[PDB]
């Protein structure tokens with residue numbers, strides 16, 4: 001064995017190499033190659049080590065799959081129990097304080113870690129269920145929401161009404177560009193909607209924009225905040241992975257609660273149907289969202305796209321779900337070639353259920369909400385999602401994604417492009 | 422139009438004519454008419470009709486022009502700044518104001534430049550082939566930005 005011993009050395013070899021070497025972006029060609037080869041040797045051992053001990057490394061962190069740990073708590077606990085395997089909060093604070101172009105790419109190690117974990121028929125499912133449990137922040141807010149029916153947050157406005165959980169993305173100044181805080185609010189909101197007995201159906205829509213170019217008009221989503229990403233503010237674990245295993249997965253499978261109510265023996269997770277209403281446009285992570293709703297409406301002037309065909313990161317789980325909606329040809333036209341799909345063209349019905357003139361939209365959205373109220377919709381929706389996406393499929397995809405994305409999150413072509421927005 | 426006759430020699434020489442509602446420019450054999458009321462999304466009015474007809478007349482009378490193109494230009498209004506907009510129709514404000522003329526606007530555009538887009542301009546018997554083509558017509562291309 002002695003793989004740990006080896007890794008600890010490869011890591012040390014790197015850790016000390018960075019202390020003597022000059023600051024990133026001031027290094028010479030011979031220097032960049034040395035630190036590069038060092039990281040490479042370190043990372044290769046991380047894979048080799050986990051390929052045979054991932055389960056043991058995980059059993060120790062979760063007391064043999066007896067304690068559920070969300071993504072952040074897992075990697076943090078991994079950092080302290082296995083120095084060198086993944087970056088400490090400290091190592092990561094230094095990284096988060098540098099613009100993307102100058103990071104050492106320590107997150108990649110977390111990518112290596114989560115891939116091995118997720119690949120296990122034992123740990124992966126356990127980690128997924130962990131992410132399906134309600135956020136502690138939502139539990140805190142649950143009593144006040146059940147009473148007020150209102151919760152204002154930084155990126156989302158939640159309001160209960162007529163049995164509908166109305167989530168409104170309200171970053172009026174940046175066309176709802178996504179960031180870490182938006183993911184926390186989205187998950188918090190989704191958790192509240194699913195935990196409130198007063199809520200029967202959920203609705204996600206964008207609110208009025210204040211920016212001069214869209215003043216007075218609604219805009220669903222302009223995707224990830226490219227400025228922050230360039231700035232080094234987009235977290236692999238806390239943003240990219242958290243949204244896929246968190247609130248987006250809960251939109252599909254609901255929230256795993258404790259055995260604390262009747263029927264839990266047949267429904268451990270509380271799920272509910274969701275409606276998405278797209279105003280203006282849905283780009284990137286926003287268009288990504290759509291592949292998970294029970295109902296989708298859009299105003300006649302909107303379009304859908306995953307633009308970074310060139311130099312972008314992987315469009316989340318779209319590579320996993322789009323084929324199902326559009327077939328492999330259109331799927332590759334949208335993601336590999338960047339084809340944008342307008343609401344009024346025939347193929348938009350592969351993604352949207354209903355397209356309406358902006359002055360008929362609100363009415364159509366209301367009518368949509370009231371058609372998904374019953375228990376028949378709940379049963380049917382659960383069986384359909386079960387057939388459309390299996391536990392293994394989602395898991396295997398999210399496994400390779402963890403790493404593949406980690407790598408794209410530090411690709412020179414991506415960093416460069418993002419720096420020009 | 423008499424106004425086009427006046428401007429014909431200067432257009433044949435410069436290949437450019439700036440007007441209040443339209444910008445005409447000859448290039449690569451193309452008569453490029455640009456509706457440029459950047460502040461009101463090219464809302465139509467009496468002056469725009471005079472310019473449109475004047476422009477169409479010039480395009481059809483210039484031997485240097487083979488094909489015509491009509492397009493809207495960049496808007497300055499905050500809601501469309503930097504983007505092109507073809508036409509938002511008649512100026513509703515003026516119409517309310519009593520500034521839309523039945524004869525000079527509504528009828529003039531239909532029997533004037535719009536009919537010339539279809540049948541060309543009837544000239545005098547002052548050139549060969551006039552016996553088989555009294556009107557000079559040319560093909561037109563329209564490019565619509567925004568709406």
Ligand SMILES: CC(C)(COP(=O)(O)OP(=O)(O)OC[C@H]1O[C@@H](n2cnc3c(N)ncnc32)[C@H](O)[C@@H]1OP(=O)(O)O)[C@@H](O)C(=O)NCCC(=O)NCCNC(=O)Cc1cc(O)cc(O)c1
Pocket residue numbers: 173174175177178211213222223224225226227240283284285286307308312313314315316317
């Ligand atoms: C939407 C637009 C076409 C609008 O054009 P316009 O009408 O020309 O408005 P603009 O003047 O450009 O922008 C209005 C306003 O919003 C801001 N804006 C617009 N888009 C953005 C983004 N993406 N981030 C931040 N701010 C933005 C823009 O900076 C303006 O403010 P100012 O810069 O101060 O002027 C434009 O903003 C644009 O091209 N944005 C690029 C959209 C984009 O490419 N997003 C990339 C998406 N890529 C992903 O989501 C990747 C991803 C996301 C995920 O969530 C998960 C995942 O796994 C992968």
Ligand SMILES: CC(C)(COP(=O)(O)OP(=O)(O)OC[C@H]1O[C@@H](n2cnc3c(N)ncnc32)[C@H](O)[C@@H]1OP(=O)(O)O)[C@@H](O)C(=O)NCCC(=O)NCCNC(=O)Cc1cc(O)cc(O)c1
Pocket residue numbers: 460461462464465498500509510511512513514527
């Ligand atoms: C185009 C619009 C939808 C744009 O919406 P927005 O993005 O909301 O821009 P807005 O803020 O409304 O307008 C931008 C700007 O352009 C101005 N604008 C827009 N449309 C017009 C019109 N039609 N006239 C004058 N000014 C206009 C508008 O007043 C704004 O400036 P401010 O008032 O100071 O704010 C809106 O402007 C609009 O609804 N215009 C109504 C368009 C219309 O109905 N035209 C009526 C057409 N009816 C005919 O052409 C009839 C006709 C014409 C003929 O030529 C011949 C004939 O026989 C018959």
